[PDB]
Amino acid sequence: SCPQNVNISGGTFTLSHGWAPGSLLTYSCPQGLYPSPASRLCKSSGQWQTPKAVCKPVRCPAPVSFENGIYTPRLGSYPVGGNVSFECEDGFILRGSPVRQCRPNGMWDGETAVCDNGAGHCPNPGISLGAVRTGFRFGHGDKVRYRCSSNLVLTGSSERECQGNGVWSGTEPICRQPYSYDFPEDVAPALGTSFSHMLGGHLNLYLLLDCSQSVSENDFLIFKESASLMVDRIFSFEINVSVAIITFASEPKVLMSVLNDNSRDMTEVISSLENANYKDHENGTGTNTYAALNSVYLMMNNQMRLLGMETMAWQEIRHAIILLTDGKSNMGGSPKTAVDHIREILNINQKRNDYLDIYAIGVGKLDVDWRELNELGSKKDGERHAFILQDTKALHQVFEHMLD
């Protein structure tokens, strides 16, 4: 069997199949600390294989640059509970929170600090903490390119263009750490605001659920619960909406469609959702997110054909997609490819961008990849669409208070 000297300092550990070869060891540390290594492999009875274990402290990113201003104190990487103050030179009016405190999730609080004189056509997008920006011209039609530093992963827009309406294209980038996650309280208002923009006609909502082997039976049960509260709330607003339920695996399965007229009834959608089970996805336990998005696209095209090319009844149809996945797309190709098809078929532009929002809610603590969630989710100014929650308890928590 494998050696037992796998203890972590300041935390605990768990095993999948004991000390037998092929068993996966999971490391856990209290909040404010990140396990390192995250997980170990027992090998073919060899020494534990890693992609001494210690719960290293969380450290938020430090401002690589702060254009036309100073930031005190100056540190390489602020520890948990630390503070940073942002006041800048004369003639420049600060935006965002002057005081930002590094939360235990590896993220700061408040809007990113930037001061702009207003001479530029568009407002100063600013350098988010831990990121860099290229191009210091804010003229109309100009562009800025963002790059993360050290081992951070970029979530958001890697390229923003100053549009005519005085709003930079895409969202504000936020360099993030691989171990960083999101608290439900922080992300509930963001989801509320994004869905408020959606509800502002008839709306089409697609719920995509994960049922691979990686997600457990209880985890999928909580996914179903959160989906049920989600559809319960949207129907409570007395707004013309049709909701579809898709549970995907190695091969995607459709539990409901927008073509059927039952999608506008609360009882019908709840009955369809509750009839979902794990047995149907037991034969194939892959995570083919591209196939699920392709099924969504097939629904789009069928609604296209039945409604019509230029009918008003379809033009006012808005589409919102929700994905409760673990972010481990391992077959079917890149899920971004189907999003390109959806954007092409919907004729997405600077004006029709209101008609398509994609929410990519990641769940888990081991195999969640920030790049995949960021790539799937839509990117709009002032709103966040890609989320990661450490536990499905947090998922139920954020949904049950998601609207107001």
Partner: protein, 321 residues
């Protein structure tokens, strides 16, 4: 044969990085009521700061104070001076220099933090081992081929042994210019508004085969006031239709040759006015692929012998997998 120390170094997390390197700071203007104390936070640059001072008061006229020389010194640091020009896809050799001013021998492992957009040696994970004798300095050579095409943050770190707890880390943003070199395309048009044929002129649009994509196309108009032009440059553009009017003479003559940044994609038109012998020079800049080791000097260093690597940089089979 040579003894190497491994993982008995500083943890690399306690080492305080140095990132603020301003050419000038403390540009503020303050109202002093006969006494004020400022709590300045020194930047991380290791030079001497000559703090100037000027006073402007409503009752005591004007005075200029004697500059105050202010010195900052660390006694052991990794001084790094980035090259003036760094083109994308062009190999450059970063030169962090470790100045050891202490009275003891120091062993330091120097490495560059692996970052996206930089192709370092062996993936950037290896740390180069160098030793700096007391009262001396040693350079470390890092060869980098930047493929980022955009500004990126590198963080070179020096880690001493646990026996002598020293170290320094420097994080400067390295602006990567885009592929190719810059070309200048000036176009000269004499401007006689008296002749009716010269009242309206159009500059041909630019169709350059060797212009590189994302060619940072910037147009500047150089119009000379020598004899009262009202040259109004109107232009359709991909970004939009923008026209800024230039009145060079301003009913006045003191070196009023003008220059104004002009934001166009392709097309440009001229509307002339006044009476003069002015000259218009629209200047176009864009990236181009072109080449030039000197044609005059040349040099070649050939090395033969056995060099011992540290068992982590040997690129070959492990023989047991």
């Amino acid at each position: 044969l040579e003894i190497l120390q491994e993982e008995d170094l500083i943890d690399e997390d306690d080492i305080p990085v140095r990132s603020f390197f301003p050419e000038n700071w403390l540009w503020r203007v303050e109202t002093v009521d006969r006494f004020q104390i400022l709590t300045l936070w020194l930047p991380d640059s290791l030079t001497t700061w000559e703090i100037h001072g000027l006073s402007l008061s409503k009752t005591k006229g004007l005075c200029v104070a004697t500059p105050v020389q202010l010195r900052v010194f660390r006694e052991f640091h990794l001084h790094l001076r980035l090259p003036m020009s760094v083109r994308r896809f062009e190999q450059l050799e970063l030169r962090p220099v470790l100045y050891n001013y202490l009275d003891k021998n120091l062993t330091v492992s120097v490495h560059v933090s692996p970052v996206e957009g930089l192709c370092l040696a062996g993936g950037g994970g290896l740390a180069q081992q160098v030793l700096v004798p007391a009262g001396s300095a040693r350079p470390v050579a890092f060869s980098v081929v930047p493929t980022a095409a955009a500004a990126v943050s590198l963080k070179v770190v020096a880690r001493g042994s646990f026996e002598f707890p020293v170290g320094d880390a420097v994080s400067k943003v390295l602006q990567i210019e885009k592929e190719g070199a810059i070309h200048r395309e000036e176009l000269v048009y004499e401007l006689n508004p008296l002749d009716h044929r010269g009242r309206t002129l159009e500059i041909p649009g630019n169709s350059d085969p060797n212009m590189i994509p994302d060619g940072d196309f910037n147009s500047y108009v150089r119009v000379t006031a020598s004899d009262g032009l009202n040259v109004t440059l109107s232009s359709t553009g991909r970004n939009g239709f923008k026209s800024h009017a230039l009145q060079l003479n301003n009913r006045q003559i003191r070196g009023l040759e003008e220059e104004l940044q002009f934001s166009l994609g392709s097309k440009i038109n001229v509307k002339v006015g006044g009476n003069s012998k002015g000259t218009l020079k629209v200047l176009r800049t864009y990236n181009v692929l072109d080449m030039k080791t000197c044609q005059d000097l040349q040099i070649e260093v050939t090395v033969k012998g056995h060099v011992e690597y540290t068992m982590e940089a040997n690129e070959d089979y492990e023989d047991y997998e």
